[PDB]
């Protein structure tokens, strides 16, 4: 069953931006309803935990700028696994998240902190979301080769040979 | 020129007939062979034009299928342009043809761009265009001027790229 | 970065050769056939080298992660960013291999091994045929 | 520009067409 690749997949939510608008405060809230947000990530678990509790270079800059991002670490350091964190922000139109997974290897002999490993690239441009360059290059080259093949077969069709002259047109 | 001792006669700054300082020009086997071939064919064309004044085929000479056909065209060019009185020119042209690293003008331009993008000395650039070295240290030892002036990683990258650029015969 | 640098220089020379063949085809008068063959063969073998070198360094290209510059402004150059970002094939090639697969259309595996044995048999047969007659 | 005001655009709104009854009419084209 034909599936559109998620790298080119682009979601638009006019109702959400009309109701709430685009801001770093609710950029994760905007991302929550997208298909790219896995329901198995610990961010959703933290979200239900918060809901239950209520019912009952630029990395350091964005680190020190917002306190909710602080709360994100102090709620995310306890849970290791696939997590969604912000990468960088330039207002009022550009935001990009950092898709990384954490394995808090607390074993004896490792003086490093929890291991952070990239998984995917996500770019929020306007109200749209974008998600390999190797594929782009090979696709461009193969389409170029197809066009070249068509041109060369047409040119060879145009070619006419005679023994007494050689090849002419 | 281990210590870049080029003397007064071959200074880096040259005074031309116009009186303006120019960078000293150094050509490897490929560049010199292409330049001399172009000059010879231009002189032959001028001679033919003059003969027509007193009283098509030239496209096949520059484009050679093989080394032997190129040598035959070279012999014909020397017969029709030099007169056969200059054996040293024939020996130099044969040495250029047999050990020309690069036959196509575009590839020679690529080699020139790769070698002189770093801004090295023209002597070193011409030597690198003449010599094909497997390892950076081999070139550095065989070219004492390149020592202490180019990083080993850059030299290795340049040598590997040049080896890849060599057109298969 | 070294692998992508080599890819850059080789693709740049390939694009230069493409520009060449372009501005010698754009002339109102067609040059001699032989010059066209030489240009075709040189550019096409250069494309082969491009493919081979891109094959060699897949790991370095894959390991790299794309990210826009902090200094690069997206508000004014979003069109330029989207131009390079998009990667979907041209449609005509798409329905091209769709019709190709339509025409082509444990069983598949044993046909695959039957193709293996036909290939090996044909190779051996032509080796024998070449050995039969002295070609030197 | 940043405030999306309803029912006043130069060009027809995509959200207007989404909220328009033509969307469900196409969805309920079988019922037609």
């Amino acid at each position: 069953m034909n599936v559109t690749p998620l790298d080119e997949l682009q979601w638009k939510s006019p109702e959400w931006i009309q109701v709430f608008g685009l801001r770093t405060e609710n950029v994760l809230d905007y991302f929550a309803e997208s298909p790219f947000f896995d329901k198995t990530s610990n961010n959703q678990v933290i979200k239900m935990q918060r809901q239950f509790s209520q019912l009952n270079p630029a990395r350091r800059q964005i680190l020190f700028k917002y306190p909710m991002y602080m709360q994100l670490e102090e709620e995310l350091m306890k849970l290791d696994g696939t997590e969604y964190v912000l990468s960088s922000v330039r207002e009022p139109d550009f935001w990009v998240i950092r898709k990384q997974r954490r394995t808090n290897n607390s074993g004896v002999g490792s003086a490093k902190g929890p291991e952070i490993i990239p998984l995917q690239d996500y770019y929020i441009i306007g109200a749209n979301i974008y998600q390999t360059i190797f594929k782009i290059v090979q696709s461009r080259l193969m389409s170029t080769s197809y066009h070249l093949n068509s041109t060369l077969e047409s040119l060879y069709d145009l070619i006419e040979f005679q023994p007494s002259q050689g090849v002419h047109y | 020129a281990a210590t870049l001792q080029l003397g007064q006669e071959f200074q880096l700054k040259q005074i031309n007939h116009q009186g303006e300082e120019e960078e000293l020009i150094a050509l490897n086997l490929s560049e010199a062979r292409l330049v001399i071939k172009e000059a010879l064919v231009e002189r032959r064309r001028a001679f033919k034009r003059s003969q027509k004044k007193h009283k098509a085929d030239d496209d096949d000479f520059m484009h050679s299928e093989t080394r032997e056909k190129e040598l035959e065209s070279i012999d014909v060019l020397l017969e029709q342009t030099t007169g056969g009185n200059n054996k040293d020119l024939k020996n130099t042209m044969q040495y250029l043809t047999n050990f020309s690293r690069f036959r196509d003008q575009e590839t020679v331009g690529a080699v020139i761009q790769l070698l002189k993008s770093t801004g090295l000395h023209p002597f070193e650039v011409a030597q690198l265009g003449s010599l094909a070295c497997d390892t950076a240290d081999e070139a550095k030892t065989l070219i004492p001027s390149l020592n202490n002036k180019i990083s080993d990683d850059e030299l290795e990258r340049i040598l590997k790229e040049l080896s890849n650029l060599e057109t298969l015969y | 970065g070294q692998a992508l640098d080599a890819v850059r220089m080789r693709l740049a020379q390939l694009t230069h050769s493409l520009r060449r063949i372009r501005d010698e085809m754009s002339k109102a008068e067609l040059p001699q056939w032989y010059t066209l063959q030489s240009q075709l063969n040189v550019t096409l073998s250069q494309l082969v080298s491009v493919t081979s070198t891109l094959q060699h360094f897949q790991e370095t290209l894959d390991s790299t992660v794309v990210y826009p510059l902090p200094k690069f402004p997206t508000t004014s150059h979003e069109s330029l960013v989207t131009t390079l970002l998009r990667k979907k094939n041209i449609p005509e090639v798409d329905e091209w291999m769709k019709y190709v697969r339509e025409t082509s259309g444990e069983e598949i595996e044993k046909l695959l091994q039957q193709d293996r044995e036909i290939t090996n048999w044909a190779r051996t047969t032509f080796r024998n045929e070449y050995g039969k007659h002295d070609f030197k | 520009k940043g405030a999306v005001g309803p029912n006043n655009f130069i060009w027809p709104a995509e959200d207007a067409l989404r909220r328009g009854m033509l969307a469900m009419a196409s969805l309920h084209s079988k019922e037609l």
Binding site: - | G109, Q113 | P91 | -
Partner: peptide, 25 residues
């Protein structure tokens, strides 16, 4: 040096083929 730089071969007129489909909520 560099014999000649490459001519700008930008094609902004290219319409692109981005698939758009997950717009409905």
């Amino acid at each position: 040096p560099s014999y000649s730089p490459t001519s700008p071969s930008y094609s902004p007129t290219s319409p692109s083929y981005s698939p758009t489909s997950p717009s409905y909520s």
